[PDB]
Design a protein around this ligand. Sequence first.
Ligand SMILES: Cc1cc2nc3c(=O)[nH]c(=O)nc-3n(C[C@H](O)[C@H](O)[C@H](O)COP(=O)(O)OP(=O)(O)OC[C@H]3O[C@@H](n4cnc5c(N)ncnc54)[C@H](O)[C@@H]3O)c2cc1C
Ligand SMILES: Cc1cc2nc3c(=O)[nH]c(=O)nc-3n(C[C@H](O)[C@H](O)[C@H](O)COP(=O)(O)OP(=O)(O)OC[C@H]3O[C@@H](n4cnc5c(N)ncnc54)[C@H](O)[C@@H]3O)c2cc1C
Ligand SMILES: [Cl-]
Ligand SMILES: [Cl-]
Ligand SMILES: [Cl-]
Ligand SMILES: [Cl-]
Lengths: 384, 384, 364, 363
Amino acid sequence: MDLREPAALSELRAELRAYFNGLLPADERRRVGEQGVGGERFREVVKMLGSDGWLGYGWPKEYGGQGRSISEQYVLFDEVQRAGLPFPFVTVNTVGPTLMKYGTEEQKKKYLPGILSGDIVFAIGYTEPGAGTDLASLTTRAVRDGDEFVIDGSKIFTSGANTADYIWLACRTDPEAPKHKGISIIIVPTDAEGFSWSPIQTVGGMVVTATYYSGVRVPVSEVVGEINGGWKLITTQLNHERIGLAALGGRMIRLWEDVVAWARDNGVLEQPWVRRDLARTYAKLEAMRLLNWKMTIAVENDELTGADAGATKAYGTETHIDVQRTLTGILGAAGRIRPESPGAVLAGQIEQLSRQGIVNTFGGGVNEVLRDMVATLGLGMPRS
Amino acid sequence: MDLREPAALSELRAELRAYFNGLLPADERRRVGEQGVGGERFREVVKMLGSDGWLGYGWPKEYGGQGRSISEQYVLFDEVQRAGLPFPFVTVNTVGPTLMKYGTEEQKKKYLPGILSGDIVFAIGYTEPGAGTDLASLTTRAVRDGDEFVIDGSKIFTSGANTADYIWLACRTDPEAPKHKGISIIIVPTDAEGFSWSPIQTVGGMVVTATYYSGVRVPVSEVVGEINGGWKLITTQLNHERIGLAALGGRMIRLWEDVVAWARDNGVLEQPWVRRDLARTYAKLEAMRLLNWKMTIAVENDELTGADAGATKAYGTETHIDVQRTLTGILGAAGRIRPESPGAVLAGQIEQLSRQGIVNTFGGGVNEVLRDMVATLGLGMPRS
Amino acid sequence: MDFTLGEELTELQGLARQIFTDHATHQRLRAVETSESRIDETLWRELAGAGLLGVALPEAAGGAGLGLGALCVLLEEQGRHVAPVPLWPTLVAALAIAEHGTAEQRDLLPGVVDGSRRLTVALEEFGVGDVAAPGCTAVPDGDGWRLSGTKAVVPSITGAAHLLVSATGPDGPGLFLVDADAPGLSWERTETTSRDMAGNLTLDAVPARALGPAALPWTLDVARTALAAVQLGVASGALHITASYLKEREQFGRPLGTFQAVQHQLADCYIEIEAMRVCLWQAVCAAEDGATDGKAALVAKWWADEGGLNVVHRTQHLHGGIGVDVDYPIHRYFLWGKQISGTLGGASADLQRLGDLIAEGAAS
Amino acid sequence: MDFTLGEELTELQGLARQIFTDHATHQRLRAVETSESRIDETLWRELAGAGLLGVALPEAAGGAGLGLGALCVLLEEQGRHVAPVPLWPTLVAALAIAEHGTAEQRDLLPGVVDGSRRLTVALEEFGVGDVAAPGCTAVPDGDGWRLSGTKAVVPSITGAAHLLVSATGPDGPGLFLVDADAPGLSWERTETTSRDMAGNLTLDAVPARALGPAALPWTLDVARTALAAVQLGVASGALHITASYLKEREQFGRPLGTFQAVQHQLADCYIEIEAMRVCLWQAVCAAEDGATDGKAALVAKWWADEGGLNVVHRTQHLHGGIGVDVDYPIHRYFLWGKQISGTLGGASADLQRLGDLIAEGAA
Ligand SMILES: Cc1cc2nc3c(=O)[nH]c(=O)nc-3n(C[C@H](O)[C@H](O)[C@H](O)COP(=O)(O)OP(=O)(O)OC[C@H]3O[C@@H](n4cnc5c(N)ncnc54)[C@H](O)[C@@H]3O)c2cc1C
Ligand SMILES: Cc1cc2nc3c(=O)[nH]c(=O)nc-3n(C[C@H](O)[C@H](O)[C@H](O)COP(=O)(O)OP(=O)(O)OC[C@H]3O[C@@H](n4cnc5c(N)ncnc54)[C@H](O)[C@@H]3O)c2cc1C
Ligand SMILES: [Cl-]
Ligand SMILES: [Cl-]
Ligand SMILES: [Cl-]
Ligand SMILES: [Cl-]
């Protein structure tokens, strides 16, 4: 039972840390992190990462990737988010890998090289106003017309649709089939006639979108996998997505450390209640950091249970909120000051993240569903 | 919007506290409080309370009681339990009042005078091994045989059956009717042929029982209310029970105050973590104390809602556990010493209460069921 | 005892609810929260003309004389509607002046009542920020005083004609009135979580007039109580919106409101709000009785800071994606609940302050 | 890294599981928990014969030399069976002596390995009870020492041949070996939450021998880690029993484990146990690398004291009435988890101690 980072990973880490912190000045880097995949510098960042080879860091070498281990991919995902940079997670961790497994040779030739270089970015079109947690009830329609599909519907919370080149779109291709046997994944260019989007400004600052499909026509060959078998894609190949989300914890550890240094320097650290609060969040961040590595090692050995996955995700995202609340309390009167305003502490990052962390308890799996799965798959409870 | 106790009640409260703490010496009082309704001195205490007129304090004068107000009853229930004394709550607050409302004249003349004097005590026979939260599914059977009922079955957790004169027994008199319309209440004397009980030793110290009914024959004239009309009796006239259970919080306040003084006088109170824990439990006990009074006042005005009753009960019993956990931590090494062993702090009361508080979250209404009721009845949610 | 509003406070509640409902619409909130002052001046004027700025202030001032309980009823309605007007900074400052101010300070109160004069309070500082021991310094200047230091994130400072500023003089901490245009006073506008425009104040030997010597501990307790009243409103409004939404939003063929974990999260919000409410009104009674120990106000404020923040976190989660949308109403309850729960210090700082009062009460 | 036990510790775990399973039956627990010593002497003998008393101790002493991780694997299995034997007091004391004792004191260890010598540790006092700053005094007596003071609830004192007593000498806090028959030493038997029989120790100038100058902070950290390991086993066994119970117990026409609120309480237990476990092994690895700042042991112990007590409270509530019955198993886990979560101070005391180490490490 060795819980220590290998010396190889620590060197990689310190080098990635400097690289990512060096791409942009700190104030500019804060802004790009807030803006996420919807921002006007996202594609710029994606292109820099692609040009320097980081986008296919974890991809197999036979697809042009560096073929690095799951542990090294995890350090990369950790350090890019720790720097506050956006990273094209859905493209590199969902779209790429699914195309490698389910893609035609023509689909692979068309999308993979551009994803690698940062010239092609996807957004995921799953969620609908009427189908969120219950995604299998989606109703965006794809009707076959000869060699084409005609797509009519709308999606909501299509993150990055406004900067994406393609939508990874989930559609109802068989209205009569049982809900799980009637969905297809179809790739839709964001410049297709009949496609549009509208902004949704979030409280955290990033802009997401609703997307609309009015008579959009795509070739049948742009289906990924089996027609009516897209639910099998939506529910599999999730392990990269899981470690990507777990890697967000690195940033909260950074900000914990930065608050301690802030509090040491101005005397706030002398207060018993600050010390208690720092101690409790330290203990919770330790567990988070170790559970996140344990999941990562499991993925590396192909031994990750859905129970451990969901348990780790629910604890981690709830711990981010806890740490954000608690650290904000330690900041005192400065804790309410937004980024870009005078008096902000640590540039307002904790104030801003508090308004973002409140989404991750239902992104990447709804925590109530994940606790059901822990009880059912983890403890053998019958389904609720 | 007046949240103060009237001076009259405060005077009553001080006089009761002097009386109840004078009834038995502290160490004997602690023993009988731990032993509760199953104990060998329970009937002795009840008889003392009867002779002094406390049992019918809240009973109407037309039934031999003093007709005191609901607020005075709540003060009495608080102070008797604050002194650590057992009180025959089911007899005075469930059986008595239901006989007043539904008993025949013969039943009222037979049972009410003896209950007032402490010569008659009842145990409630509701719960079965297979019907706990789902009480309406009970299977203990009562088959009519002329002017008797023949009772076959078993009850579990029949608190006080070993010291009671009568069982207040819910039984199935109509196997064909819907489950809610086939139950009757029948009074079974504990010396009946075919009745027996066996002890269940609880982790908290008190002994409860299982009771068994093997061909027990009881007159039809000992049915309370109408045959098959028992479910209404079970699920109504609960306000007295609710305030008696709420009154249990008064002892947790007393013990919090005692630990503060204990900690003051050995230096423990200087530690910041101790002051913080006292403060949090004080804040939680204040909410409890005031919500308990709000419920009592609502009962006195006949406007208590089920949602409020359920919210207040669930909050209160969970706060008892929090205060017990937290106070045990403040006691340090002596927190683990059981009553009657040397080194015990405050006679081990907190150590023992911690092993008893773990029962009250599912007694007097299961807390999960009460939260469902809060959601549906208090907030309009459709039922889960 | 009694746990119900009198008929005067009930009438006041309904009048304030109707005004806030009228003005705190999506369109108006969006416009005000992107304005220079971040204050809804139309709503201020309607509250003035409806007599709601005077309702808590003394008859002498033109007010109704209904005191802290009336202010808390008004503030809870404001929280229920997340309506951006500086009621608690102006009216807590008015109550402090009424109770501890000189006669010339009290001459400001008629302009508060009639809507033409706003106040704010500067009670907090950056860093340790112990609100009972302000680092800002007061120096006697013959009969008056000159204040030197900095105050943090003073709320709704735009258009405020006077500030009550806490500072420490030779005889300990006190409360001082300063004119917004005084020489030596300056501030940087700074945007807060709730989208209010606050000011970081710099005072360079700024002339000021003392309030009475008990003013500061009393004002802190009244402000704690007032903030818990806003937070009670914020929590209640959030829970009502969320329950309404979950009755109608269907997933898996049924309302989300039928899932047990959903119902239990709702029921925990319901319980915290009931607890918050009784502790709030205990704090108002204590103030009415002239309570000086400070415990009840801190109990109220801790419930607002811990319970109220719990509620708005749950109502964000239970909404899913639509709750993040700034064009949908619930996010504003999160912003308000989050900011209020740290105002004058957060839940942990309250516990430490309260534990010390308990320890001190024990030895005397 | 790696989050799996190796070959040897997995074998050790299976041997401990078999032995505790054989002995910690309902009948034996009831007899032992009403006996005078409250200690399962048969189990103690089977542990010795199986090599389990020696597995964590040095080879010089006839043990296997597997160290602290061996001890934690054994203590986790103990906790999973709530089996009453003084493993952590004897084996923590034995590890202290192996690490900081004189050659003379290390001569005690063969008797511990073969099961004939039991030890305990006296690390707590009544009142403030700062375990790092014992009130009990140590006064030089020529080349030895004499101790005067009181120690509170010394665990499993009956039949202990020796005690490690923490006390403050002229050069600060230290750890001293005392024989249980030493003159001036007495105790009062006192029953604890777990049903152990502890002793409140009175020391009237009791002769004692010092361990090495680093012994006390080292021992407190090892004891915190060992207690975390017991509590992980307690919480894990408790969850397992409750899960099996709720799959079978039906109300409203279906198993209780089909209620979403029930599934979420179980899931929260599962999460707390996973967190407890990683934080325990981090403390073990920190002890291996010779860490002395004490943070990792306190993180581990806090998880035991907060999360572990959370688990056994949930498993009590989820059982309803049957869980209060002392003839049903789950109440014992509540008892153990309750007592362990206050041993050497509770969760709040740990957070205060941990926060001071963080602040001091910041400067
Ligand atoms: C950071 C982030 C990024 C996202 N990016 C994308 C993207 O690129 N593309 C995309 O299509 N979607 C995206 N999503 C959307 C996400 O998939 C949905 O928000 C999620 O599926 C929940 O759906 P919903 O918002 O409609 O919430 P609802 O389904 O309405 O659920 C609302 C709440 O109800 C409760 N609840 C729901 N079901 C249950 C249940 N069974 N038991 C108990 N409680 C329950 C939970 O508290 C939940 O939060 C993103 C979400 C987040 C947070
Ligand atoms: C102090 C005390 C006094 C008592 N006095 C009496 C008495 O005088 N007479 C008498 O007849 N009985 C008495 N009992 C027994 C008591 O009524 C029952 O224990 C209660 O009905 C719960 O039933 P159960 O024990 O069978 O638990 P179960 O019904 O088996 O429930 C076990 C657990 O399952 C969970 N659960 C149950 N239903 C739901 C649900 N719908 N949704 C989610 N979770 C759920 C809860 O966590 C619950 O604790 C008493 C019990 C106590 C603790
Ligand atoms: Cl998602
Ligand atoms: Cl009951
Ligand atoms: Cl400042
Ligand atoms: Cl509203």
